[PDB]
Amino acid sequence: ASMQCKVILLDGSEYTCDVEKRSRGQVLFDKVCEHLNLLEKDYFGLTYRDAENQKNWLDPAKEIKKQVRSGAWHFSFNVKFYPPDPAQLSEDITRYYLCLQLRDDIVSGRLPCSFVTLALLGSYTVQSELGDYDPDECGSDYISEFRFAPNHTKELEDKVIELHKSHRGMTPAEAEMHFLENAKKLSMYGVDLHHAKDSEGVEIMLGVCASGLLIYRLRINRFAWPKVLKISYKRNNFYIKIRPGEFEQFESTIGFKLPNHRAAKRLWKVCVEHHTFFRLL
Numbered sequence: 156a157s158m159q160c161k162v163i164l165l166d167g168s169e170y171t172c173d174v175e176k177r178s179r180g181q182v183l184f185d186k187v188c189e190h191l192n193l194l195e196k197d198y199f200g201l202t203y204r205d206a207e208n209q210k211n212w213l214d215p216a217k218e219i220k221k222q223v224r225s226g227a228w229h230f231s232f233n234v235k236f237y238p239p240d241p242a243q244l245s246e247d248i249t250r251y252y253l254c255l256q257l258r259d260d261i262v263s264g265r266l267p268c269s270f271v272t273l274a275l276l277g278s279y280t281v282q283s284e285l286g287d288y289d290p291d292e293c294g295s296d297y298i299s300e301f302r303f304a305p306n307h308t309k310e311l312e313d314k315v316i317e318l319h320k321s322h323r324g325m326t327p328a329e330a331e332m333h334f335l336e337n338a339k340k341l342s343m344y345g346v347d348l349h350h351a352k353d354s355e356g357v358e359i360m361l362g363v364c365a366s367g368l369l370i371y372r373l374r375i376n377r378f379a380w381p382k383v384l385k386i387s388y389k390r391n392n393f394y395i396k397i398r399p400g401e402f403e404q405f406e407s408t409i410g411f412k413l414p415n416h417r418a419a420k421r422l423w424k425v426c427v428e429h430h431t432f433f434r435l436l
Contacts, residue, residue: 160228162187162201165255170232180215180222187232195249197432200235203228211421212428236432237345239365241335247328254283254331257338264305266343274311275337277303278318283330288320342374349422351393351411361393361411363425365433368395380434388423390416 160183162170170190174182180201188196201213203223213222213230234256244250258280260266261273268276281298295316303311322330338344346362346369353359353372362369368383370376378397384406385396393411398404413419 158226158228160230163229163231164191165232165252165259174219174228177218177220179217180213180219183219183228183230184213184215191232191252192248193252195244195246198234198236198238198249199252200233201230202233203230207417209417209421212425234345236429237339237365239339239345241339242332247331250328250331250335254280254334254338257334258302262302262305265348266338266341268341270308270311270314272337272341273304274314274318276334277301277311277315278322279330279334279337281315281319282322282325283327283334287323288316347425349413349418349425351413351422353412354410356412359411361422363422363429365429368426380430383430386423386426386430388413388416388419391419393419393422 157173157175159171159173162183164170164187170187172183172186174186184196184199184201187201188194188199193199200215202210203213205211206224211222212235213219219228234253238244238253241250241253244253257266261268261276280301280303284301285292285297293316298312298315298319301315303315325333343362345364347364348371349361349363351359351361353370357372359375360371362371367377367379367381369378378395382397383395384398385394385408387394387396391412391414393413394408396406396408399407413422
């Protein structure tokens with residue numbers, strides 16, 4: 156009358172529990188956050204891969220059964236809504252799980268940034284995890300475990316060490332806070348990127364975040380939520396209604412062709428959820 160679930164956590168470890176066969180996603184999410192002693196859980200969710208190996212958020216309001224057709228109820232715990240100002244989070248631990256996610260986002264190449272920013276962010280990670288630089292605990296080899304960037308230059312490594320040396324006295328809470336302030340200013344911070352085609356058939360990327368919808372073709376356009384009147388899908392296609400022009404005198408619907416109905420439905424859902432979260436709480 157129950158099914159085993161496995162969840163990859165942000166530090167790489169694996170949470171196992173059992174849930175009732177007809178459990179809604181909420182059941183499992185609540186168990187994972189309890190495990191994590193996470194009170195600010197609303198920023199977070201669970202992803203799964205479907206039979207086409209596409210990533211999907213587990214809808215907490217719905218039976219897991221209906222979403223994951225396989226009995227392989229394997230999930231990944233992830234940031235869903237990236238806070239525009241992490242300093243305003245109530246708890247250090249929320250910020251910590253947030254850093255872990257952003258570290259992956261960087262290493263995986265999902266959040267690009269300057270060599271400069273990579274080294275600064277790296278040095279904050281090192282101060283958080285290792286503490287103060289010391290020539291006697293720190294060979295010149297003491298940061299061999301850390302990944303900082305999709306690609307490790309021995310010069311990135313030296314710059315991380317240089318900056319680490321300057322952070323002396325800094326507590327994890329502060330290393331992390333500094334980490335979050337440089338990270339939140341990055342261009343792709345918190346943007347969920349989706350492949351699409353525009354009306355001419357030119358391949359573009361439609362990003363969703365706290366502030367609105369982004370189009371990239373090379374970043375191009377950006378629609379703050381306040382200016383999105385309606386978000387909808389039909390078939391392969393994704394639509395937004397906006398009031399263009401200086402005085403917003405008319406409505407215009409802009410359309411994007413997505414690779415299939417399901418890609419359109421995932422984009423639409425993610426956009427709706429972001430609008431609800433960021434604009435209605």
